[PDB]
């Protein structure tokens, strides 16, 4: 289990423009196109992103390409972020995957906002951090994926995905 298989499991794979849990227009593996209702705004974003006329339909290769870029951007964002970096550096490899997961789905800005949780993880206070993390809109909105991420944080194993 690596970060790519973990996220494929959590975001799923779709070849056509779709709406995410939050109403937003998405494609492939969790790739947010636009937080705006125009499906026509989304097809545009899409074409811009693939560099061709697609409609709302892309190939698997296209989605993986998107995926590779997104994971890369997530890691680089973490390493550039003053809040994120020290937590990342302090952690073991599995748990570092759990933070990439969060960042990829909620953005750099969102995760950095989890101040107290970040401080607990940095302090290696696993059970506490897991309890604090569950106290969010994020967990309440998508409980099964949030619980999977949170268990990864709590334990340091890929148990939640072993499922799977």
From Swiss-Prot:
Disulphide-bonded residues: none
Effect recorded for residue 117 to V: 50-fold decrease in enzymatic activity
A GO CC term assigned to this protein in UniProt: host cell cytoplasm
Protein induction: Expressed late in the viral replication.
Pfam families in UniProt: Phage_lysozyme
Location of this chain's protein in the cell: Host cytoplasm
Effect in UniProt of substituting residue 11 to N: Loss of 84% of enzymatic activity
Described purpose of this protein according to its UniProt entry: Endolysin with lysozyme activity that degrades host peptidoglycans and participates with the holin and spanin proteins in the sequential events which lead to the programmed host cell lysis releasing the mature viral particles. Once the holin has permeabilized the host cell membrane, the endolysin can reach the periplasm and break down the peptidoglycan layer.
Protein known as: Endolysin
Organism (species): Enterobacteria phage T4 (Bacteriophage T4)
